[PDB]
């Protein structure tokens, strides 16, 4: 068993727990019992950004990016109710945890794409008739994506939403119409989608692990510009418990 001093500075703190290859079992679900996820962890391994289509209007693809904010990207210590529904499907309702990380990735050509990688208010459900969580189980769900910056955030000229100037004070007599989009901060709230594909199960401990893919918008800098579409891929871990 490892301590903080074993892990500190190694990068392991940003990694989700894994399960060995022998963990291909099944975790029995009792539709009479209540369940919870005690710890959900999401460790992104790849960030893809949808290229802004030239104007050919064909299929714009997701392209690779380089992480520049280091090992600060993982979601963890997430907990929430695991409902057993009438139809035998399971629904995870996220209640709390470290369920967001700001992330900046860099596109070919230098363009930096900040995003609020998140699963805030995640609601994800399995297929019906899940008597046991197996390596065939998956969760599909949606979550909220709030503004990358919150309402107090001030831009470099001191303008903000819940705080700040409401004009370009360095340009006292500039016509205000053309600066409106910059002057008037707006708070974004959009929806994201995530798939959790279970690859490993310890039927005894109640630990599951696998891969995820999520899709969400990036930062729109409080309404100053259009967000990019981001696809996040990685691995996850969850501990399921009687509660």
């Amino acid at each position: 068993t490892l301590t903080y001093d074993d892990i500190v500075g190694t990068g392991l703190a940003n990694k989700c727990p894994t399960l060995d290859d022998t963990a291909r079992g099944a975790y029995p679900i009792d539709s009479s019992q209540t369940y919870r996820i005690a710890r959900l962890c999401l460790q992104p391994t790849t960030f893809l950004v949808k290229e802004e289509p030239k104007n050919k209007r064909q299929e714009a693809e997701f392209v690779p990016t380089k992480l520049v904010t280091r090992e600060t990207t993982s979601l963890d210590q997430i907990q929430g109710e695991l409902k057993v529904n009438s139809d035998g499907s399971l629904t995870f309702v996220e209640e709390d945890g470290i369920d967001f990380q700001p992330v900046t990735v860099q596109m070919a050509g230098g363009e930096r794409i900040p995003l609020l990688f998140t699963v805030k208010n995640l609601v994800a459900s399995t297929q019906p008739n899940v008597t046991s969580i197996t390596t065939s189980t998956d969760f599909k769900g949606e979550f909220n994506v709030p503004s990358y910056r919150t309402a107090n955030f001030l831009d470099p000229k001191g303008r903000g939403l819940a705080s700040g100037y409401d004009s370009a004070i360095a340009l006292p007599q500039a016509k205000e119409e053309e600066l409106a989009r910059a002057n008037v901060k707006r708070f974004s709230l959009t929806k994201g989608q995530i798939s959790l594909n279970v690859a490993k199960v310890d039927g005894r401990t109640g630990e599951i692990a696998g891969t995820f893919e999520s899709e969400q918008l990036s930062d729109d800098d409080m309404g100053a510009h259009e967000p990019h579409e981001v696809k996040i891929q990685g691995v996850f871990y969850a501990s399921i418990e009687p509660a």
């Binding site: 709030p146 503004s147 919150t150 309402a151 107090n152 939403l161 819940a162 705080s163 409401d166 409106a180 989009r181 002057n183 008037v184 901060k185 707006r186 708070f187 709230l189 309404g223």
Partner: protein, 97 residues
């Protein structure tokens, strides 16, 4: 047409009273008996369709119900403004002294 939603919200009852759905928790210090216990329950159980719905919060004492009734005149409700409630800003809005 671009609008600052917080400034706009100041033109509603939000600007005249404690909005149970939006106002930061420190505002409950303005009146006797609301902070921190009732303040916490109120913020935790938001949003409310009406002011009087604050009375239905589970586990409240009779004394608590009394204080709430005495202070309903100081409360309001408007639509939840994402900008004011995200980031946990209702618990800490970056304002101190």
């Amino acid at each position: 047409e671009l609008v600052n939603v917080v400034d706009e919200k100041l033109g509603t009852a939000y600007g005249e009273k404690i909005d149970l759905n939006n106002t930061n928790i420190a505002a409950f210090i303005q009146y006797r008996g609301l902070y921190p216990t009732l303040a916490k329950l109120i913020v935790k159980n938001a949003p409310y369709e009406s002011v009087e719905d604050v009375l239905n919060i589970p586990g409240l004492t009779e004394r608590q119900k009394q204080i709430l009734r005495e202070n309903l005149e100081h409360f309001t409700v408007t639509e939840v403004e994402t900008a004011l409630v995200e980031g946990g800003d209702r618990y800490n809005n970056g304002l101190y002294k």
